[PDB]
Amino acid sequence: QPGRFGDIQSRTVESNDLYANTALKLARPSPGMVHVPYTQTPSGFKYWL
Amino acid sequence: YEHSTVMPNVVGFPYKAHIERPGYSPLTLQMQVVETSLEPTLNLEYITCEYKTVVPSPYVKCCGASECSTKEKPDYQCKVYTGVYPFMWGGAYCFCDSENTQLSEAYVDRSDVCRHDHASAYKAHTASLKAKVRVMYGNVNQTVDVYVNGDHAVTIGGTQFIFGPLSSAWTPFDNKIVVYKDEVFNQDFPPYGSGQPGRFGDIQSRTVESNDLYANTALKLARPSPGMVHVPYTQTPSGFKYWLKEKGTALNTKAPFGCQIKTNPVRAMNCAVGNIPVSMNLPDSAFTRIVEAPTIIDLTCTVATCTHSSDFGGVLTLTYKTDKNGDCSVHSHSNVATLQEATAKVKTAGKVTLHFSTASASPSFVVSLCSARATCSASCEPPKDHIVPYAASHSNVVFPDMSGTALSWVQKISGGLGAFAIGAILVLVVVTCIGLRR
C-alpha cells in the first residue's frame, strides 16, 4: 500500500523483478513552459523509519 | 392550458412533470436547476483599518514657557513639560539650566492603505433568491435566468413560466456580519462611537472617503529622559491586526446545507432546502392529438434486475401491441422510483427497455406509455460499494410495498392471530347466548 512499509517489494537483493505501487499521477504542463509535472506519495520506507 | 406543480430545490436532480388533457396525447416535461444564488440586502454601518500615529517634532523654547490649546483632531493629546535641558550633537541647546520647556503632541489618523485593506460591518435583512433553470420538452432545449419571487415570468417557446416563492424562508447569515476580502463572519460588532481599545472597532468611519473619524486607542505621553530630545508615548496596539490574527472560523467552512459562500456581492450559492412551485400556461401547438397518436393495448410490465444504488441501477421491459410506429411519452406515476428517459420509441416488434433508480427493498409503481397504464413491482438487492463521488439520483424513500416479503410475513402472522381471536370471540358469544336463553 502506498506511503506505508512495503510499497516497493523485491523478492531478493539481486532479483530483476519489482512490485511498486506509489500512486504516480501526471499533470498537464502549464502554458508556455517545458517540464513534466507529477504528484507522487512519498516513500513508505522513510515513513516507517 | 394551465398547470401547477412543485419541484425539489436540489442542484442536478432531474424532474419529470406529467401533463394530461382530454383530447390530446400525454406530454412529459424536463426541468433541471443548474445554479442558485441567494443575496441579502445590506446596509453599511462602519469600516475599520489599521492606523498610523502622526507625531511631529517637539517645540523647545529657551528661557520661556508655552501652553497648548485643544484641537478637533482624532485622539489629540498634548502636554507641556517644565525643567528640561536638551542636548544635541554639538552641545547644549539653551543657556537657561532650568527655565526651559518642551511641547509634545500626537494624534491618530487612518493608514495610507485603508482604501485597499479594510473590513466592513454590515446588517443582514430579508434575502432574495435567483436561479438558472433549464427546460426540455419536444424539440426546444433552453436555459433561462429567473427571479424566484413569484413575480418573474419568462417565455420559452411561447410558454409562460412563473416560479416561486420558496417554501422555506431560511438564511445562513445572522443579523450582523463582517466581510473581509472573500470571507464572511457571523460576528457582532461594537456600535459606532463606542469602540474599545485593543479589539475590533478601535477605529470607525461611516464610509471609505468620510472626512470624520472616531479613534480610541489610549494614547498617553511620557516625560522625556534627561539630556535627550525625543517624544515618548505608550499606546495599545492596533485592534485590526489582533482581529486578523484570531478572528475565528469563517462561515465559508461552517455553512449548513453545503452552501458555497462568495463575496462581491455577498451571496450564498447552491443551497439545498425547500421546494419551488411552478406555474405555467402551455400553448395548444405543443401537444399531439389522439387521432395521430399511437394506441397501446394489452401492456404488461416486468423487471429484469434491480439494485438500489445512487446510479440508475435497474432495468424494466415493457410488452405491448400497437398499430403504427411513433414516439410516446413515458413517466412513472409514483415517487419511489424515478425514470431516466422522458420519451421512448415504439415499434411493431412490441418491446421497449427502460432504466430507473430506486432506494427501497421492494418498489411498486405505475408506469405509463402514452395513454396506456400498467403496474410494476420487483425485488432489489443492496449494493457493495461503500462511498461514491456523486449525489443520489433518487428521491429518498425506504418503506416497502404492502405486498413485499417482510410486509407479507407481517400480514400473514397478523391474519392468523386475528382469525384465532375472532374464533375465540365467536365461541364466547355463542356460549353467552346459550347460557342466557336458559
Place this chain on the structure above:
Amino acid sequence: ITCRVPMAREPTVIHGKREVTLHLHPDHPTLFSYRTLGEDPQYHEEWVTAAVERTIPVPVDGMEYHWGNNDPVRLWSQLTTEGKPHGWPHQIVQYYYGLYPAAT
C-alpha cells in the same frame, strides 16, 4: 499583481462503513478542513505539520473536505449493510437493523 503557490499532494483515501480514513503527507504546514452537508454540520480545521491519519464521518447527506490548495472534494455514502432483504425473518430483521438500528 499575481503570485504563485504550490498545490499540495493528493491524499490516500480508504473507504469504510460510513467513514473515511485519510493519510496526509505534508511537505509544508498545510491547512486541512472538512464539513458535513446536513442540518447541523460538524466543522473542523487544523494546521497539519507531519504525517498523520484522520477519520471523517460521511453521513448519507454528504461530506466535503478541503486539503491544502486544491479544490474541495465531496463524497456521499450509499445505503449498504449486512444481511439479506429476502430471506428468513431474522435476515430481513438484520438488514433493516443495519440500515436503521433504533427504529428497527
